[PDB]
Each structure stands twice: as C-alpha cells, then as structure tokens.
C-alpha cells in the first residue's frame, strides 16, 4: 500500500509522530542536565528510548509510501518515490536524525544523553503535524492558545534546566543566586530541584521579578540574557495570545456586524421611534436564530464550482420541494443557487403589492406567507414552504390582464427567508429548460382564471 | 477683529492656547495646594496674584472671545454681533463655561475651575488642523495624559501619608527630603507596575495599595496601548510600502524572476515611492469626493494640458474633460513607451522628463527629443480607421512621468466635439 | 397559562431576575465556605438570601417551560410544544441538579455547590445586554471588568483555603496566625487575601517567597495563569477603547494623505486652504459618514423605507413628487445619492454637457449669468433643477445642454439623481417628462 | 571627473565603508569616556583605530562631493552642479563640524564627541540594506535590535558617570567603590552597570533603593524612558514577529469563517471533507495567494513582464501565441485569469453554451460521454480549447454550443479568457480568429 498525503491515515500517523518527538524534545534536555534524573531511572529511560528510536525508523518507511502529487495526479510506483525522497533535503537531515551513536555510546560512558542531541532534527515533523491538525480541528481558536501555552511551558522548562546546570559548575551554596547546598533538609531530594529552577525560571521569563541578586560576573551575564529574552520573546508569545483573542473579537463582530453603527447613525437623525424599533426588533432577531447577515462573502472564499454545489447540500430540502426543479440531469440546480439571493422578511411587509411591477421569483424557504387580496380583508391562500409566487409577472402570458402588475399582494404571516431571482436571470433559466417553461406557462394560466 | 472665524483664526488659536495654559495651571496646582503643604501665609500672595490671572483670562474669554465668533446656519455664514451673542448663549459651550465661572482659603475650593475642557479639545483639533507634523503632538498629549496621571498618585500618596502618621509605618513616607520628588517615585514604581515598595502593614494601607495595583494595571496598558496606537499610524505609511515591496519581492523569488527584471521592478518601486510620496494614489482618489477630486486634477495639471501644440485654445470644456480622463504612471529609463509594430492605443503627454523619438537606418538614431509640456504618439490614435501603427519608437532618456491618455475615453469626448475634433485630426495629418 | 416571547422586554426583565442569584451564588459560596468566620458572623443574613435565590431558582422552571420558541415564523402556544422542546434538551438536566434538595449539613455552604450549574443564563443575560444597551464599549468593559473580579475573588479563597489545610504560621508563605490579634479580624484575613491574589495574578510581585515543595506549585500555577490574565486586559480593554476611537481615526488618516498629496502636488494654497476647510465643515457637522455604506448590511426592503424617512422633508417639498402621486418615488429615493458642494463652486455652467438632475436640500443656490456677480434667478431648497437638459425635447433652444449657470453661495448639500435612473422612472410613468416638457417650455423664452 | 551613481552597487559598498566608523563612535567612544580604565589598558589600541575614523569621514566629504543627484529624471554629470547643489544642504554643515579637529582649537574622548554628528551615513546604510536584502523581516529585527543594545550601552555608561560624580561607595545606590579589589576592575564594572542598566530599562526587577534626592531624579527619569521609547521598540518587535505568521493567519482566517458557517449550517459530513481536501491541497501547493492583488500597484507594461516570465512553459504551448505579431502575448496576459478544479469536477458540460475558453497550465482534461467513464481524446499541457463556442464556425452542428462535456481527472488548474475580451483580440488582429478557426474547423469534422 502507498499512503496519500490528503488521506486520514496519513494525518492519524502525523499526530502518532509528535509524542516521542516530544520526549526527545523536553526529557533530554533535562537528563543532561540533571545527573540525578538519569541515574535515578535509568531502566525507565532505556525502555521510552528504544520506542523512540523505533519510531523513528518506522518515519523513513512511511516516508518512502507517501505518494507526491505530479500534474494533479497521486503517484503510487515506489521506484519513483524514493527518487524524489533522496533528493529531498529532509532525508539527509532524517538521515542525521537517526544517526547511530551507539558506536560512541560506550566510550563516553554507560549512558550519555548529551549524545542523542541529534534527535531534535526530527523537530519539522512535529510542526507539520501543527499545521495539519489546525486546518481540519472542530475549534481553531482552542488548539491556537494550547500551541501557544506549550511553546511557553517548553521555554521555561529549558531555562530552568540552564539555571540547574549553570548552578552545578559554579558550585551550590557559593551565594544566594545559585542553588542552594543539598546540606538542608528541603533542597535534597530530586523534586525541590526542578521545582526550585522552574520557580526561578517563571520570574524572570515572565517579568515578575522578586529574584535573589547575582554576586558573581557569571551570574550577571545569565541575568542580561534571561531578562532580554523576557522583554521580547515572552512578550511576542503574549502578544499571539491577544491577536487569538482578538480573533474571536472578530468572529464576534461577524455575528450582527454593524449593529453599533446602525444605532448611531438613527439616534442622530432621530427620524421616529417607531422606525427605529422595527429594525432593532428585526436585528434583535438575527442574534437569536444566528443567521449570517451574508454568507455570500463567506462562499467568495470558496471557487465558483464549489461555491454551487455547498449551496446545493445547504438548501437541498429547499430545491427539492419545488415543483420545478429537477427537471432533468440534476443540473439546472447548479445554475440557479448561484444565481438566487437570500432575503428576509419581516411580518406584515408586503413582499410584492398589487398593481406594481415584481422582477424577484420568490421561491420560499421557510416560513408561512398567505397571499391576500387588495382590501386585506380576506386571504386567498396561503403558501406553507417551498412553493412559488408571483411568477405570472415575469413570464409573458397570452392574454394576461396587466402582465407587469401584480394581479395579487402577498404578505408575510411571520418572520420569513425567501430567495428572489431576477426576471431577466429566470428567462436565462428557461431558455436553458423547455419543461420549465411549459410548468410556468399551465401554472400561471390558471391562477389568471380564478 | 469684531468678527473671528474659528477654523483660520491664528488669533483664535493663540487665545486658546492662553485659555489651555491657565486650565493646565488650575488642574496641575489643584492637586499640590490640596495636599502638600507647600501653601504658606507668605506664598498665599503669589497664589491669589496667579489665581486671579487665571480668573480674568477665564472671565475675558466669555466676555469677548466666545461673544464674537462667526457661525454657520443653514449653509449661510453670520457676521452679526447680536445674533452672535445669541447663538454662544445657546450652547453646551456657555453652560460650561458658566459652570466653571461659577464662584462656589481652602485650595480645593476653585476644583469646579477645571470643567473647562472644551476649550482644550477645540485647542487641540485647531493646532492638529494647521500644525504639519501633528503626530508628534499626539505623542506629547500622550505623555502628558500619562505623566498628569502620576503627578495625582504622587499627591494622593502623600494625602494619605498625611492623614496617618508621618514615619509611623515602613509605608508611610517618613518625610525626610524633597516631597514631590519621593512621592513621585513611589508612584512611578506602582503604576508601571515595576515592584519593590515596603509591604503595607494596617489596613488601610493594604487597601490604598491593592486599589492603586489594579487601576495602574488598567490605566497604564490603555496610555501604553494609546501610545503604541499613535506610534504605529506615524509609520503607517512606510509599513504600507515595504508590506508591499516585501510581497512582490517574496512572490518573484518563488516563481524564480530572473533578476534583472526584479532590479527594475525593486527600481521602479522605490523611485515611485520617493517621489511620489504613495502608492497608487487612485485609491485615495475614489475615497476623496468627485468635485474635489476633479478640481484637484484641474489645478495640478491645466498648465501642462493647457501648454500643448495639438489643442491649444479650442475648447476649455474638453481641456475640462481631459483632465477628467488623464491618468499617470511612471516609465523607467531605457523602456519603449511605444514600437512602430504596434497598433496605437493610448496618447501620451510627458509630465515631467525626457523621451527620445528614435528614427533612422537600423533605428539607433534620435530625431527629436521630446520635454516636458509635450504630446506624442496622435498619429496612430487618430487615423483612416485607426488601423495605423506607430511612426517610430520613443524610449525615455531617462526617468519620466506621462499622462496616459485611452483610445476610447479620447474618441468619447471626440463625439461630442466634432468641430475640434476636425482641427485635431487636421493638424495630426498635417503632421505626416 | 401564558407563553412568555424570547423577542419581549418582559423576557429581557426576566433574564435580570434570574441573573444576580447566579451572581450571588458564584461570588459569595466560595467566600462562605473558606472563611469560616464569615459564615458564623452573618448566619442570619445568608439565610434570608438563600430562600430568596432557591424560590428564583425554582421560578425559572415554570418560565423555561412556558418560554416560546419559533417554529415556521410563528411562537407556538401549545403547553406540549414547549414542554417537549427543554424537557429533552441538556439544560433541562443542568437546571434540575441545580434545584435538587441537599438533604440527602443543610446550613453549611459546601453542600450548596450544585446551584453553580446554572450558569447558562448568567452568560444570556450579559451577551443579551450588549445588544440591547446605547452604549456596547463600555458595557464590555464593565463586563470584563467583573469576570476578573471573580478570579482574583476565587483565587483569595483558595489561598485561604490551602493555608487552612497546611497550617497558619508554620512557614513565611502562609497568611498569618489567626489566634494573633493582629491578623484575627475577618476584614484583615479578606483584604490581605484578596491583595496577595491581585499581586501573584497580575504579575506585580511582592509575594513572601513560597517554602515547601505544595506551595510551590500552587505559586507557579497562579503565575502561569496570571500571564493569561494579563493578555486578557491588555488585548481586550486596549482594543475596545482603540475600537471606540475608530471613527476619528480614520478621519484623521485621510487628511494626512490628502496633505501628504498636496505637497507632492505643489498644490497652490489657496486649493489646499479650500480643501481643508470642506473637510473641516463635514467634521463638524458629523455628516462625513454614510448612509448607504452603513445601511447596505441591512435588506432592501426597509433600507429604502428608512430613507424616504430621513429625506421625507425634502422629498414633501418636491413638487414633481408630490402633484403627480405615482409610485416612482420609493425605487427613485435609494437610486439618489448625496453631494456636497464648497462655497464658491459652479454646479453648472452654461456650455456644459448635463448627465445629473439635481434636487437641493440646504443650500441657497443661484442661477448665476456672465460673470456670476449678478444671478439671473434665485434658486431655493426643495426645488429641483437641471431636468430640461437631461430630458431632451424637439421644442428646445438647446439639447443636453445647461441653458444658466447653477452656483453655490455658500455651503450648500443637495442630492443627485443620475439620468439613467431616471430613465429607469420613464418605464414605469411616461406621463411625467411630458408635465415637466411644459414647465420647461416657460423657461426658455424666459 | 568620477562620479558615482547613487543607486549603484559601489554607492552601496561605500555605505558599509562609511557605516562602522560611525557605529564604532556611537558605542565606543562613551564607553572611553566614562569607564577610565578603557583607555589606560587600550590606548594603543584605540589610536590606531581613530586615525582610521578620521580618514574615512574625510574621504566621506570627497566622496559626498561626487555623488550624482537626479535632475528632470536624467543622473547629473556636471561637477559644478554636484558641488553647488552640496554646499547649500545643512547636511554640509554636519559632516563638516564632525572633521573639524578641536585638538588644534589634548588626546581625549570628550574632545572627539563631534564625531557623533555624523550619524546620518548610519541611517541611510540601514535604510538602504533593507531593501537590497534577501529577507527584510528578518534584517528589521536585527536592525530593531541593535537600538535596543546601544541603549544599554549607553545608560549603562550614564550610570557609571553618574556614580563617579556623586562617589563610589558612598551610599547603597551608587557603585561600591573601586580601591576594594573586589570590585575595582575593568570587566566587573562595565558587567554590573550592563546589568543594572538592563533592568532598570526593562523594568523586570529591583534595584538598591536611591538615597539622594538626585538619585530619585535619574531613576524616574530612567524608568519614564525605558516605558516611552524602550518598551516601544519591544513592542515593534514583538509585533513584526506576529507578521511573519500572520502570511499563514489571513489564508488561516478565510478557513475559520467558512468552517463556522458550515457548522451552523449542518452540512453533510461528506461534503465536511471535500472543501477541507480543497483547503488542504490550496496549501500545500501554497496557491492561496492571488497574483492580482499582490500586483495590483504596477502599471501594464510591468505586469505583463511579470506574467510572460512565470507562465513561459505553458504560454510558449498555446497556438494562438508565437505569432508574430505578438500583440496577443502583451494584451490576454492581463486579461487572463486562473481556476483550480477538483477531481471529478466538469470543466465544461455538453450542450451548454460557453463565455469562455481554456488553456491548460498543469493537469489533465479528459473529454467524457454521458456514462464519463469513455475518453475520447486526452487534453494535454498547454492545449487551448473552447473555440468552438466562442467562435461561430461555418454549418456549425451544434449551433455555437459546445459539442461535448469535458471531466477533470486528478487536480487541474485552468486559465479562462472571457468571450468579449477575446473577441477584442479578434477584431485588432484578424490573423489570430483565422488561425483558431481553421483548428476548430478540423474538430467540427471529426
Ligand atoms: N389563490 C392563490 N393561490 C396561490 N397563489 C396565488 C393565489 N392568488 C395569487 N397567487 C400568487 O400571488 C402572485 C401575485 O402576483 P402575480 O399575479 O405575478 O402571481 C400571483 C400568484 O403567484
Ligand atoms: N518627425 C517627427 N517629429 C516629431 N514627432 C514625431 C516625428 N515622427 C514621429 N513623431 C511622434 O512619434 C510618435 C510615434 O507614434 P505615433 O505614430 O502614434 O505618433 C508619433 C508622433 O507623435
Ligand atoms: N429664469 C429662470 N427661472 C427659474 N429657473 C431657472 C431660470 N433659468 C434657469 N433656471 C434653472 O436653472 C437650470 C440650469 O440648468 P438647466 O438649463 O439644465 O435647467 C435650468 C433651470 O432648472
Ligand atoms: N473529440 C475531441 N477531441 C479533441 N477535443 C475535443 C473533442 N471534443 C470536444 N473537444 C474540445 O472540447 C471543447 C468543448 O467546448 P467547445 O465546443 O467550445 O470546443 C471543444 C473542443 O475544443
Ligand atoms: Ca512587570
Ligand atoms: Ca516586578
């Protein structure tokens, strides 16, 4: 089998890749610089070790499987895989990644974790599996601020591994910077260690301060850096977590855009108070049922071949209810939800009245719109959903009685979504389907004798 | 003056800046005699001296300065004093004014002096109308906000040193030295938040302490963030050029341009920018409204389009309409504005620079080198049909800016002018 | 037996009623059970508001039952209808374990945890205000305000709670030992806890140093939380004051460029003078925003019927408007846009091709000849000219041509209509340009 | 004569040569001044390099002298217009004050500080790298960086000088003093004012409390400073940092809002996956970028340069195009526009009529019947179809529609040039519609 690179099996292998990445990034690190961590389980790490070795050597073979897209089109021959895959600049730094030090291994000593420092060359294959998991998640805005708080736990966690191991050399109970002598009873065991240096590593990094003064010329140059990497490096991590904030700032200022605007403009003008309840009731609304104010911006994004057919699946109960639609072939219905435009009404608005010119198809989506006569005293019907009317005015009718007026007024019982349509798109339609025309011609004539 | 126009009086604004000098006095020395005892029966003269100069400036402002001011109404200016007075009476201006001046020796006793405020931001909007630079004088009332604010902690610090003992508590200021200057360390040390103060001990002090904390954390981010705010629409301008560069750079990399063309684009990008000043100005252009677009376009350019050989005097309405419809775009040196192969479709008016008309056996040769203030190029325009091409080759000498000038647009205006357009295309066969 | 409207103000009262139990419940329950003097000394008053919040508690059963829903554009009034729309749903559960009785001590504040669960309406009601109030920014800044006032609230609790468990006065971290006078007084325990919290969340520092091993992971936890915090106040409460300030700015950002634009140009001063001075008239009449940029979110339908409603003085005094009483007027009042002209400036000019139709709303106009000194005829608001060029007619002295110049006395607004709109009028009514051919008739012999 | 072009790469050299004397002044020579013991250890070290400073802002004032100037768009050649147009400069007065010598007016630092107004060489060479630079984000961060060292530096130095005036060891604040050996060297005393100058800037920790009212002044006026202008600088890295990212962000912000609005819209879970593969494939090939509105600011000649040169394969395939002509190769560059396919997708549908045609720039079209499974000839690179269409064909069968639907198999990615911009390419060149008729008449008959 060759695996695809858009395949799930290939991105399930991507987040399987990250957690011995992981504990060669962080433990590592620690082990060399803690010399009581890697004495204390060394049976425990050599199990975790070789698992990640192993692992490893499973990610050349995965990488020889993985078909590359050449002219739109997945490659499956293995021959020409492992072409490209050597050519590739991350072979020879897979290649380093797994470099065997096991040849130095006993020379140097038992176990030395200062040799497999060339486990963090398989560092971009965690970022990759970053990005995959980003695009496809259900909440981006969640994994953002854990990506970002992992970044940060990782940095201090090598700064207090430095702080540990620059104490060692310069010898413990030298001054009160460093750390303290194993003599008291607290600083002896293993766990007041780290505890010690990631506690002194959270108040510089993070700028909260309250730290013992550096006595010797070694100390102060530690001091400089680590308060220099605070100001900047912390402050761009934080100042990530604002922009995700401010991201959701955005996405809720998507939700009823221009609401605030839409106030100040009216409050100035002060025209009526009863103009101004109508449109804080009906954008009162939209907050409460959550409608888009436009989701034709948000399809821009999308390419037009695949902007029709989203649209399709999203109104599909809508365009099959409808006596004209598919006619024949399933492809009029790709034409006609591009070309329609979603409205909303509000109760007691009059969609189209009598004795005026109607250029918009409206099919109905939802909601109850009983068609009414002139004096409103009487409703001739009313249409549930997915039924249309006022179609007589756009069609050409022979002997139709006033053919642009509308023969009737329609208005709307509740709240309600229509898509309208323009005349001149409709005969676009038509033209394109002789049954639609045929639908419209019985359809109009028979209203027109009742 | 008996009547004073707000918008371009320099008379107005200086007074404003006398008006915004005595409020500063009244607001910044409120605070010092509320709470430090740096009033003395011996000083209490010079106080009343400056308090009364405060005073007058503050009733001569109402007597004169707002009575006389020119207003607008209905789009119809007034120059009348009584309806003047009238219309500063009806106003939120003459309420406040009249709040402060209201009469009401203790120093907080003149605390309504400082309602007046409106007369700092009109000061403020009048110096930011006519002071070029003003972004520098947003910085200084930023940090001004900020030190202002520091100047009330350093006074309610000492306020509540002087309601409990002084020295009594590590807190506490003890007193020795200069005041203000102790005081105001402590406030710079609490509201940037900095740390390292003795540790409250009673109550009281805790609770000063943990409400200073918290509206520091607040306040100090938002002059902080006003400042960072500021800073970055100062350098708005220069990030929009190089986000742009850095773009069109990145993306010819990736497609792998070679880099002479990248060289003249890099080139082309920043002789634009230097002399321009921006980038695609059309954009600004649509957001200004038409008239004043228009009439923008009239005054820069009518010398230039007035000062030609081909339509000189025959109608000021299409000279109008030409200035409507002319656009500009910068040709680097070297570059062939046009080639005999071509088919003619735009006329070209050089702004500023030189082109060369090339002509001759094997070309390589410069019959006339066209200036400033000159058209080229009317040949293959306006022609049996259009179907004639370009004459000869024109390169720039050197860098140039032309007024481009489209087929379609030129022969639009022609149809309502056929009268100047005969003489046009009279002089254009003449010319072969 | 009434169904309560999700659109009414009665429900919006409501979600006011329900809310400061909640908000009780969340501040004060972890307050009374860490400090126990709290509870012991205010037992009487902690009573009365538990029946209180428990009846409210219990009244938003009866509400969310009876609480409407939309289906097809129309509320529903059967009891079924409702009941089977939150009997099923997860928040009937929560609100349930929210009212359970504690019996299986009642007094005791640990207990009566569960009524935390209902926080679904605390959040309805502050995101329902937001919209409803005049004022959002600072609304949203009250209300981030309040939401770390709970942590750094929660956070002294706990403070107090850990050092209950350990011990007081058995290492520096601590707070103190209650059996000194000193720190005795329940204000001091709460005050300290509440400034020890403020300090280790926001970052300020200051905080005695921890000593056992428990305590310092407690410490390190509030620090990388506290870091959380402080991007919270920076990002947000620097953004929503940034956000107010965002009509200003961008004002100001375009006189920048114009004037970046006039030195480039070598604009003469008497234009740049005249420039600033427009730009200087739309800024303080607050008429540089508009309409149709703002209104174009909102659907047709009412966005040309909230138009007719500013401009209804206006289009009242029209006169072709008004005598001809056709329906022309709602699709013609969306077609027209706004223009503002300088004092000074020539809308007109005899000679000059004519492609608008222009209706005057403020300004005094005049029909200026020759020079412009002297004005053939005065010309006022509400009166529309310019039509007889527009409209070409076999009984002209001229075609498509200004017979006058218009020009403007001062600052004068007005409203343009494009020909082609008015083109698109013609379809609908043809009989208007032949009463209007007639009035133009008068005016050329004249 | 020599003169030098100022936008040549030797211009350019002589910035760099100019530059690190400056940049030498700037850090060193209050480094000299202040810490005694500098000089004293290094004084041969330094004479040799300030002879060196000294002949290069000479040579700079010979050199400046024979910098060309742009005049009416031509580089200028005449050396008495180069001199002219220098003298009247105020820069003239700067370079001169930082040659002249105010030893002949003792061998010293504080009389060698007029060398510090030649700085604007310094920001010149800075402005000018950055453009002429591989990466510029990665340069402004080090540019941004050096300010923030020199600031160090230098109130590193203020507070040695500061400390040598009040004296040392006299109280806490100021530095212990220099006869005890402890702290009496040269590489402790730069150190400790290094770090204590970097914290008092940062404001990150706490110094030894000041005693004298003077030493309150300078740390409010060091602690004001490092917020104003340090802080600043930070954040300005900080947020260019941010705006590397933010190239992944904006591709990133499109995905959130359309995953949310199908989310709300509940769509099926199949088409869930097709519009995640479409996102996923745009970024991994990194097609998400628009060439349109990322060359938007150059004029037509420049674009189409651009164009021909990253489209050379396929345009070079085209049949229409190597005419010669060669006015369709200018004109349709433009007026071309790109489209992505997915698998399985119809690029065209038979029977339909066509506004547009296509050229293949990468994958492959396969033309279908009615079952699709059938292929009856194979679209390969670079091939241009839809001709038929758009061109009427004498007897044409299919009466201007296109005679058969065409599936996309795998990903393509197609360049469609509407029917009235082609039709605009017809009428100037009438050779090119023959050419592209005369292949469609082939088609017809098969
Ligand atoms: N009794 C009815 N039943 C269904 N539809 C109707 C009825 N009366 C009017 N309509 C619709 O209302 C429309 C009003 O405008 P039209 O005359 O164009 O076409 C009309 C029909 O589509
Ligand atoms: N002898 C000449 N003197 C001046 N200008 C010329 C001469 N020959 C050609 N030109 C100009 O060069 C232009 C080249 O293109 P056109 O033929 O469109 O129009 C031409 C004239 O404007
Ligand atoms: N004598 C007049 N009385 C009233 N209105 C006039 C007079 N002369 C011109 N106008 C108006 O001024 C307008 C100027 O342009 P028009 O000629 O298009 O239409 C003209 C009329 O509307
Ligand atoms: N049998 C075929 N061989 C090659 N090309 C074809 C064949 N059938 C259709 N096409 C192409 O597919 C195109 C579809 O639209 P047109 O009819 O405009 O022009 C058509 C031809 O370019
Ligand atoms: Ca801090
Ligand atoms: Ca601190």
């Given at each position: 089998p060759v695996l695809d690179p858009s395949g799930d099996y290939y991105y399930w292998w991507l987040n399987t890749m990250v957690f011995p990445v992981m504990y060669n990034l962080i433990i590592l690190v620690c082990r060399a610089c803690f010399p009581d961590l890697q004495h204390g389980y060394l049976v425990a790490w050599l199990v975790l070790d070789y698992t990640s070795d192993l692992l490893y050597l499973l990610d050349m073979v995965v990488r020889f499987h993985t078909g590359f897209l050449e002219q739109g089109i997945l490659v499956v021959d293995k021959g020409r895989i492992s072409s490209r895959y050597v050519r590739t600049w991350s072979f020879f730094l897979d290649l380093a990644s797994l470099m065997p030090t096991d040849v130095v291994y006993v020379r140097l000593g038992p176990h030395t974790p200062t040799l497999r420092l060339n486990r963090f060359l398989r560092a971009p294959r965690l970022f990759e599996a970053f990005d995959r998991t980003e695009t496809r998640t259900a909440y981006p805005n969640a994994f953002r601020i854990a990506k970002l708080m992992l970044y940060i736990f990782v940095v201090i966690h090598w700064n207090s591994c430095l702080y540990f191991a620059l104490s060692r050399y310069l010898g413990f109970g030298r001054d009160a910077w460093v750390y303290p002598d194993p003599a008291q009873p607290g600083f002896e065991r293993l766990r007041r260690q780290y505890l010690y240096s990631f506690y002194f590593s959270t108040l510089i990094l993070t700028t909260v301060g309250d730290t013992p003064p550096p006595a010797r010329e070694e100390e102060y140059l530690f001091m400089v850096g680590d308060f220099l990497l605070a100001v900047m490096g912390f402050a761009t991590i934080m100042g990530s977590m604002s922009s995700v904030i401010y991201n959701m700032n955005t996405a809720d200022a998507a939700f009823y855009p221009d609401h605030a605007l839409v106030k100040k403009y009216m409050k100035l003008q002060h025209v009526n108070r009863k103009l101004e309840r109508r449109v804080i009731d009906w954008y009162q609304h939209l907050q409460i049922n959550?409608?888009?104010?436009?989701?034709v911006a948000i399809l821009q994004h999308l390419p037009e071949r695949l902007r029709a057919e989203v649209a399709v699946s999203v109104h599909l109960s809508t365009l099959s209810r409808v006596?004209?639609?598919?006619?024949?072939?399933?492809?009029?219905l790709e034409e006609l939800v591009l070309k329609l435009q979603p409205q909303t009404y509000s109760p007691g608005e009059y969609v189209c009245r009598k004795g005026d010119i109607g250029q918009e198809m409206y099919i109905i989506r939802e909601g109850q719109l009983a068609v009414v006569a002139d004096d409103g005293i009487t409703q001739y019907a009313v249409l549930g959903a997915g039924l249309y009317f006022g179609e007589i005015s756009i069609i050409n009718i022979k002997g139709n009685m006033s053919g642009n007026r509308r023969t009737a007024n329609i208005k709307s019982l509740g709240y309600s979504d229509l898509f309208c349509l323009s005349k001149e798109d409709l005969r676009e339609v038509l033209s394109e389907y002789p049954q639609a025309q045929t639908i419209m011609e019985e359809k109009g004539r028979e209203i027109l004798l009742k | 003056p008996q009547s004073i126009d707000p918008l371009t009086n320099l008379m107005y604004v200086l007074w404003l800046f006398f008006v915004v000098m005595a409020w500063n006095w009244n607001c910044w020395l409120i605070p010092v005699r509320w709470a430090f005892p740096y009033q003395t029966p011996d000083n209490i003269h010079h106080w009343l001296l400056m308090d009364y100069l405060c005073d007058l400036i503050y009733f001569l402002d109402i007597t004169v300065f707002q009575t006389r001011l020119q207003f607008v109404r209905g789009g119809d200016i007034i120059t009348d004093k009584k309806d003047m007075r009238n219309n500063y009476l009806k106003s939120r201006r003459f309420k406040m004014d009249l709040l402060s001046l209201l009469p009401l020796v203790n120093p907080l006793l003149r605390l309504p002096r400082c309602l007046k405020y409106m007369a700092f931001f009109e000061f403020n909007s009048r110096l930011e109308s006519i002071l070029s630079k003003a972004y520098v004088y947003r910085v200084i009332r930023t940090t001004a906000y900020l030190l202002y604010s520091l100047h009330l902690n350093s006074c309610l610090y000492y306020w509540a040193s002087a309601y409990q003992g002084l020295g009594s508590t590590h807190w506490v200021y003890d007193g020795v030295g200069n005041s203000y200057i102790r005081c105001y360390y402590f406030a710079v040390k609490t509201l940037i938040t900095i740390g390292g103060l003795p540790d409250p001990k009673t109550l009281f002090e805790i609770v000063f302490q943990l409400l200073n904390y918290f509206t520091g954390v607040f306040a100090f981010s938002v002059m902080i963030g006003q400042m960072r705010d500021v800073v970055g629409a100062a350098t708005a301008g220069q990030t929009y050029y190089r986000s742009c560069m850095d773009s069109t750079v990145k993306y010819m990399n990736f497609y792998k341009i070679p880099k002479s063309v990248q060289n003249r684009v890099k080139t082309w990008y920043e002789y634009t920018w230097h002399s321009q000043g921006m980038l695609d100005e059309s954009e600004l252009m649509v957001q200004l409204p038409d008239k004043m677009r228009l009439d923008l376009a009239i005054d820069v350019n009518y010398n230039i389009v007035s000062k030609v050989a081909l339509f000189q005097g025959c109608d000021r309405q299409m000279i109008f309409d030409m200035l409507k419809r002319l656009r500009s775009v910068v040709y680097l040196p070297n570059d062939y504005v046009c080639k005999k192969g071509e088919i003619g479709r735009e006329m070209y008016i050089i702004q500023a620079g030189q082109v060369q008309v090339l002509g001759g056996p094997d070309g390589k040769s410069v019959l006339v080198t066209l200036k400033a203030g000159s058209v080229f190029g009317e040949i293959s325009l306006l022609?049996?049909?259009?179907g004639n091409r370009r004459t000869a080759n024109v390169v720039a000498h050197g860098f140039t800016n032309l007024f481009i000038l489209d087929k379609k647009d030129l022969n639009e205006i022609l149809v309502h002018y056929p009268e100047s357009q005969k003489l046009l295309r009279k002089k254009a066969r003449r010319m072969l | 037996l009434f169904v309560l409207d999700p659109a009414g103000d009665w429900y919006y009262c409501w979600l006011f009623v329900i809310a400061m139990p909640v908000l009780y419940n969340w501040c004060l329950l972890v307050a009374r059970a860490c400090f126990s003097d709290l509870q012991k000394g205010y037992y009487l008053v902690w009573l009365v508001l538990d029946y209180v919040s428990d009846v409210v508690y219990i009244a938003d059963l009866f509400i969310r039952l009876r609480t409407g829903f939309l289906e097809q554009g129309l509320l529903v009034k059967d009891t079924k209808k409702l009941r089977d729309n939150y009997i099923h749903t997860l928040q009937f559960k929560l609100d349930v374990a929210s009212i359970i009785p504690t019996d299986l001590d009642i007094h005791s504040p640990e207990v009566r945890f569960n009524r935390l669960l209902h926080f679904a309406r605390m959040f309805e009601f502050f995101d329902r205000t937001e919209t409803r109030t005049n004022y959002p920014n600072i609304f949203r800044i009250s209300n981030l305000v309040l939401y770390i006032l709970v942590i750094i609230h929660w956070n002294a609790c706990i403070y107090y709670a850990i050092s209950k468990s350990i011990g007081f006065g058995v290492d520096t971290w601590v707070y103190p030992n209650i059996t000194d006078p000193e720190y005795g007084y329940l204000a001091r325990e709460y005050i300290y806890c509440l400034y020890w919290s403020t300090l280790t969340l926001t970052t300020i520092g200051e905080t005695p140093p921890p000593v056992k091993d428990e305590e310092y992971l407690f410490v390190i936890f509030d620090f990388l939380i506290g870091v959380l915090i402080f991007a919270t106040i920076v990002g947000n409460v620097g953004s929503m004051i940034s956000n107010m300030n965002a009509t200003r700015a961008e004002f100001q950002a375009k006189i920048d460029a114009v004037k970046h634009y006039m030195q480039f140009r070598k604009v003469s001063k008497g234009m740049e003078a005249k420039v600033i001075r427009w730009f200087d008239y739309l800024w303080t009449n607050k008429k540089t925003v508009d309409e149709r940029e703002i209104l174009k979110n909102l659907p047709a339908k009412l966005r040309a019927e909230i138009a007719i409603n500013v401009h209804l003085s206006t289009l009242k005094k029209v006169r072709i408007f008004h005598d001809c009483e056709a329906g022309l007027l709602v699709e013609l009042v969306l077609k027209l846009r706004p223009q503002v002209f300088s004092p000074g400036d020539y809308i007109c000019r005899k000679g000059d091709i004519g492609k608008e139709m222009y209706i005057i709303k403020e300004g005094k106009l005049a029909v200026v000849a020759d020079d412009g000194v002297t004005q053939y005829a005065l010309l006022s608001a509400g009166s529309c000219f310019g039509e007889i060029s527009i409209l070409?007619?076999?009984?002209?002295?001229?075609?498509?041509?200004?017979?006058a110049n218009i020009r403007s006395l001062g600052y004068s607004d007005l409203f343009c209509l494009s020909k082609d709109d008015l083109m698109e009028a013609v379809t609908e009514y043809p009989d208007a340009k032949k009463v209007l051919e007639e009035r133009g008739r008068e005016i050329l012999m004249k």
């Open positions: 959550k409608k888009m104010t436009n989701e006596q004209i639609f598919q006619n024949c072939e399933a492809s009029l | 022609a049996v049909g259009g | 070409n007619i076999k009984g002209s002295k001229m075609g498509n041509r200004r017979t």
